[PDB]
């Protein structure tokens with residue numbers, strides 16, 4: 201039942217308007233300084249790979265990766281950058297949906 205909501209909310213974040221910065225890993229060959237500043241990158245496809253393969257034990261583990269996406273987003277991107285402003289839309293969305301199941 202737990203991982204059924206994670207399926208719903210990852211589906212909902214994967215198809216969200218604001219999801220475009222987070223759908224695929226950051227390419228550090230293209231984003232100068234990313235490799236150095238972000239110790240543990242995370243993106244929605246890696247969570248999808250991990251969920252489909254079954255690599256989540258609970259909803260907490262799933263939610264940690266989701267929050268690491270947005271924690272990384274705020275570390276690397278200015279709150280008013282385009283990725284930044286998208287990041288806040290996604291984080292608020294995730295925070296909300298998560299709380300209206302738990």
Ligand SMILES: O=S(=O)(N[C@H]1CCNC1)c1cccc2cnccc12
Nearest residue numbers: 220221224225226227231273276283
């Ligand atoms: O959205 S990006 O344009 N690239 C996306 C598309 C390809 N994989 C990631 C981008 C550019 C610069 C910094 C970023 C930091 N976090 C996420 C995305 C960032």
